[PDB]
């Protein structure tokens, strides 16, 4: 079985990049749900325009994935989370997600 | 202290790409090679008509990744490494490569 890669781009205003990802290290239950496995919040190097943050989610499954969406602790980590164009959203610096999806054919740690 | 992340990006003919992530199996020194982390290989689940086969590869930091680049053990892994474009990589099936680079600014492992 291939393991499964989620990608959620975040184009952001420019600047707002590291205030985005220390939002990230207050854990809401990631770290209780089945088939996760680990996950990195980028930002692109060299971006001349607007910020670019990548949340990259490892998971032993597609499937774990698509359950994940579901669950309570989803909703619950995202219930304050905005996009600039959303009705109460003007003061988030996110400005649009877009989703990638992979297979992960090879994987190495050392 | 934030690791670092390089993307190789690869545009392959269409249908290459599970053969091109076989090529990665057999490990050809990168386990001894110093601020090296982990790699992850991986397909993009999309409609185009061209594959895409990405290396992502987890640093200690940027300079750990650039004294890879330079390297005789980076030289020798990819000595039968060609592009179509090349004037002897007629038998490849990757199109191009591009590069990004990342900062890591939040990971966490289950
Ligand atoms: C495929 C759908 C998504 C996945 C798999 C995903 C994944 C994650 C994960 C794993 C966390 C850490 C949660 C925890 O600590 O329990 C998180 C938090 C976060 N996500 Fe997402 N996310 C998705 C959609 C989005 C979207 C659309 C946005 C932006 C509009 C977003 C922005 C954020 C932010 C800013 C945090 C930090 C926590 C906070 O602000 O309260 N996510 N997400
Ligand atoms: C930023 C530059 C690059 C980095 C950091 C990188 C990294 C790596 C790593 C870590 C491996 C596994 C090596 C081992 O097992 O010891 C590998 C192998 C491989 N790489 Fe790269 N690489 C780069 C450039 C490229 C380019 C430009 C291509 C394609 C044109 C490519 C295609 C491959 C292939 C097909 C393999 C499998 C081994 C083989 O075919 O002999 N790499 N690379």
Same mark, same amino acid.
């Given at each position: 079985?291939?393991? %499964?890669?989620?990608?959620? $781009?975040?184009?952001?205003? @420019?600047?707002?990049? =590291?205030?985005?990802?220390? $939002?990230?290290?207050? $854990?809401?239950?990631?770290?209780?749900? =089945?088939?996760?496995?680990?996950? %990195?919040?980028? +930002?692109?190097?060299?971006?001349? #325009?607007? *910020?670019?943050?990548?949340?990259?989610?490892?998971?032993?499954?597609?499937?774990? !994935?698509?359950?994940?969406? /579901?669950? *309570?602790? !989803?909703?619950?980590?995202? +219930? /304050?989370?905005?996009? @600039?164009? #959303? #009705?109460?959203?003007?003061?988030?610096?996110?400005?649009?997600?877009?989703?990638? +999806?992979?297979?992960?054919?090879?994987?190495?740690?050392?």
């Amino acid at each position: 079985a291939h393991m %499964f890669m989620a990608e959620n $781009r975040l184009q952001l205003q @420019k600047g707002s990049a =590291e205030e985005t990802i220390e $939002r990230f290290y207050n $854990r809401q239950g990631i770290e209780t749900i =089945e088939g996760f496995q680990q996950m %990195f919040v980028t +930002k692109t190097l060299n971006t001349e #325009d607007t *910020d670019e943050v990548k949340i990259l989610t490892i998971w032993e499954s597609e499937d774990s !994935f698509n359950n994940y969406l /579901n669950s *309570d602790v !989803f909703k619950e980590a995202h +219930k /304050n989370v905005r996009l @600039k164009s #959303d #009705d109460d959203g003007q003061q988030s610096p996110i400005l649009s997600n877009k989703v990638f +999806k992979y297979d992960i054919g090879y994987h190495y740690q050392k």
